[PDB]
Amino acid sequence: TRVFKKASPNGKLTVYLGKRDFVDHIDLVEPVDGVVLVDPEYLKERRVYVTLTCAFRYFRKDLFVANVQSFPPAPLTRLQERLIKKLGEHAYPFTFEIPPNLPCSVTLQPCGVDYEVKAFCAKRNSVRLVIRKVQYAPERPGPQPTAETTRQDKPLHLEASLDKEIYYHGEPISVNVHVTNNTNKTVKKIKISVRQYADICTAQYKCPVAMEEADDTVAPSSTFCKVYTLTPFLANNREKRGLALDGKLKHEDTNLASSTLLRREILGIIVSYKVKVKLVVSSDVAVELPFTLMHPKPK
């Protein structure tokens, strides 16, 4: 299969990797594995090391920085052995385990957390390759979101819901609205919005990814039942600076920052999405329910 490689500025050190996406499986994390090419004569410091930087850039305050002694030797992996076999007698492997309770590769739409593998002999003696620590969507759907509100001398009994909780990026969430206005105030307008909050563990905001302001007026003392559809994606969120975008490798275009799954005081950023049904009345009622937007698991 594919094998990524990158040479050092002086052309001697060649860092070899298999993948640049490490799926942060809820319980554990996929280790960073690679092998670095080295010519002993060129090596002047006599000590070549490999490091894993989990950096929060904006400022730069790391959270897990580790070092592995590439040479001289202080096990090996299935891909590393083949990489060495291809390279020969001048390459040395390195492995990193990423402990739990560590952030997930996530960036703010122009920031955020990042994962990098840097091999150096200890400027010209440093070679850096980006990676991603990211999380798939949960395997099985969660409970159906539901939220009912009452406003009162008569109620404005409202209810909103979504079919399920696990929704992939660029997929339409169905918002079921059920109103019963026994009050004498006509329902001027209905709003169904979806907002993304990106706490920075402390700062946070509320970016509306989706908006749908319908004029489905329900006259006083009358019921109503409808199924709206709102699709959150990046088609229209280009101007919104600060939106939590998912993990990148480069300036490539990515999707909405997958909802930060958790098993609270985890540094980096914690991102979540909520669907809000707000009735504007002739003095406006609100109800909400959260959902977790992520990417699927290829298979």
Epitope: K19, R132, G170, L234
Partner: antibody, heavy 129, light 108 residues
Framework: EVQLVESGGGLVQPGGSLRLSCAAS????????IHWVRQAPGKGLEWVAS????????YYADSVKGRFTISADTSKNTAYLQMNSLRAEDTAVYYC??????????????????????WGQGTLVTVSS | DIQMTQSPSSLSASVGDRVTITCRAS??????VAWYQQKPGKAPKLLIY???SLYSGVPSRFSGSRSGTDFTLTISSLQPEDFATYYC?????????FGQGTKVEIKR
């Protein structure tokens, strides 16, 4: 399964207007690049245009630059190639295909534009007075 | 744009012939190449992608190879049913472009 269905195939006078609709099933128009391809009468293929709703990105062939317009209604989960200013150059059989964004291992490969694995049916668009 | 110049424009063969069709990109391409087999009228199929990847469901005998910018598709034992027009398409530079096709006729 994934399948695209084209509609809007019928006689239109030169310079007329048609709205080809590619209804996509088995995938969102946002988790894919929807491509419109046209083949002239008994002739080599030609790719018309492509769009991804998620990034709102549109790309057009040199033959439909400005004349046509591909957009999509993700509410209906459909793409719409509005063909305007049709001419004898636009006569063809029009197929619809897609290039998903899966198989990166994790998520969207927003730059492959690769092989258009799944193809539609083929609607005959005529241009003649 | 990129002109995926494909040759031969028409070749003759029969059952079992190891048929070869070459296609060269006008500019440099990075394995973005795919081979589509359009029969008379019907919708083009997909044969190869990534310039060397046998697409799912495509017959094994079909195979693509890259030698720089000269992408070759070989059918080891072309069968009576595999006589159609084969196009090469690069997905690197938009607008996407095809070759001109290479109809494989029958021999007698």
């Amino acid at each position: 399964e994934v399948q695209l269905v084209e509609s809007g195939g019928g006689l239109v006078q030169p310079g007329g207007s048609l709205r080809l609709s590619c209804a996509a099933s088995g995938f969102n128009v946002s988790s894919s690049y929807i491509h419109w391809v046209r083949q002239a009468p008994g002739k080599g293929l030609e790719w018309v245009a492509s769009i991804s709703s998620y990034y709102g990105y549109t790309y057009y062939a040199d033959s439909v630059k400005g004349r046509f317009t591909i957009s999509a209604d993700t509410s209906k989960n459909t793409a719409y190639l509005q063909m305007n200013s049709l001419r004898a150059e636009d006569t063809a059989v029009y197929y619809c295909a897609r290039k998903s964004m899966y198989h990166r291992g994790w998520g969207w490969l927003s730059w492959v534009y690769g092989a258009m694995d799944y193809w539609g049916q083929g609607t005959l668009v005529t241009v003649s007075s | 744009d990129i002109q995926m110049t494909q040759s031969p424009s028409s070749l003759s063969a029969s059952v079992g012939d190891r048929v070869t069709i070459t296609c060269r990109a006008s500019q440099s391409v990075s394995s973005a190449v795919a081979w589509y087999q359009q029969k008379p009228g019907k919708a083009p199929k997909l044969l190869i992608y990534s310039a060397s990847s046998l697409y799912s469901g495509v017959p094994s005998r079909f195979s693509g190879s890259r030698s720089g910018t000269d992408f070759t598709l070989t059918i080891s034992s072309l069968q009576p049913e595999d006589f159609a027009t084969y196009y090469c398409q690069q997905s690197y530079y938009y607008p996407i472009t095809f070759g001109q096709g290479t109809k494989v006729e029958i021999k007698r």
